[PDB]
């Protein structure tokens, strides 16, 4: 459970927002990309796995699940690539709600930033710091407990 | 202290590698940028602070220490901006050695990747996972201990 992440892709301003969610904590990392290619997804996963102990990734769609470049990146980084089917059907709505929530935060800051990418990183910040414990606190606690 | 980071800028292939080091653990995040502008540094710090609890940043030079954009980003993200003078003179060589180490790792992978940015993220991965405890383990343990 501490090593499980879910990929998520949502759209805004004709652009693509790629999100990785640490399932047990709700902690996220995100980036803006021109389009969701294998190359972009691969690079995003490499960055993620260099920063957090990523054991398993539930991919966001069949194209990324099939992508040879994504498979290569997962091999390189020691990531088990899995499908992202909501076997628990509440897993659709939880992601839908996060996307809605992210876009809402982006709207609240959009005017502060000239570029969408800045607004997205402001949203990551606000999300991970928000007291609900914060997601940042939860991921650290979960991984630390696993270590020791 | 758990919230203290140091900025570091090094050069390779006519490009700039911007690094943030968590001082107590040796954990790093890094990016390739065309040049070290206030705007790029500001964005990098925003990303960092959205992902880890960044309380204090020792800046890498006077230009970033003075930059109005960097100051704005530090205000936004709740970061105390400080100078990075090696008051302990071993603080120069520790960074020099990390830069040498990073460039060495980049050399070991450079052929695997077409783009420098990919090689840099491979280097971040290798660095943070390297057993010496790993830096990834240390940062989580340090921050978790602080939380509790
Ligand atoms: O498969 C890729 O090209 C790719 C990879 C994995 C990888 C790079 N070199 C390799 C050489 C041998 C095996 C895998 C790789 C990681 C991040 C990326 C990638 O593309 C962009 O971001
Ligand atoms: O795998 C790591 O060294 C690493 C760790 C801690 C850890 C040590 N053993 C483990 C075995 C399983 C899971 C995590 C670890 C923490 C953060 C990271 C890491 O890599 C990048 O971000
Ligand atoms: O100061 C910036 O422009 C900047 C900032 C801080 C910030 C943005 N809007 C604001 C509006 C009011 C106050 C500060 C800001 C963060 C990240 C960045 C930045 O530039 C690129 O990455
Ligand atoms: O600020 C957070 O909630 C947050 C935390 C927990 C934390 C808050 N203050 C601290 C002061 C010191 C140490 C941890 C925290 C952890 C990771 C994060 C966080 O945000 C981004 O990554």
Order of helices and strands of chain A: EEEHEHHEHHH
Distance between the termini of chain A: 15 Å
Major sheet of chain A: order of its strands?
Answer: 3-2-1-4-5
Bound molecules: 5-(1H-indol-3-ylmethyl)-1,3-benzodioxole-4-carboxylic acid
CATH superfamily of chain A: Ribonuclease H-like superfamily/Ribonuclease H
PDB class: transferase
Keywords: transferase, structure based drug design
Assembly: dimeric
Entry title: Interrogating HIV integrase for compounds that bind- a SAMPL challenge
Describe the structure.
Two copies of one chain form a homodimer. Chain A is of the alpha/beta class and 148 residues long. Chain A has one domain: Ribonuclease H-like superfamily/Ribonuclease H (Nucleotidyltransferase, domain 5), CATH 3.30.420.10. Chain A contains six helices and five strands; from the N terminus they run βββαβααβααα. Chain A has a five-stranded mixed β-sheet, sandwiched between helices. In chain A, a hairpin with a 4-residue loop joins strand 2 and strand 3. In chain A, helix 4 crosses helix 5. The radius of gyration of chain A is 15 Å and the shape is globular. The two termini of chain A are 15 Å apart. Chains A and B meet through helix 1, helix 5 and helix 6 of A and helix 1, helix 5 and helix 6 of B. The complex binds 5-(1H-indol-3-ylmethyl)-1,3-benzodioxole-4-carboxylic acid (4 copies). One 5-(1H-indol-3-ylmethyl)-1,3-benzodioxole-4-carboxylic acid (C5Q) sits at the interface of chains B and A. Chains A, B: Its main location: host cell. Chains A, B: This is Gag-Pol polyprotein. Chains A, B: Its cofactor is Mg(2+). Chains A, B: It is a lipid-anchor. Chains A, B: One of its GO terms (molecular function) is exoribonuclease H activity.
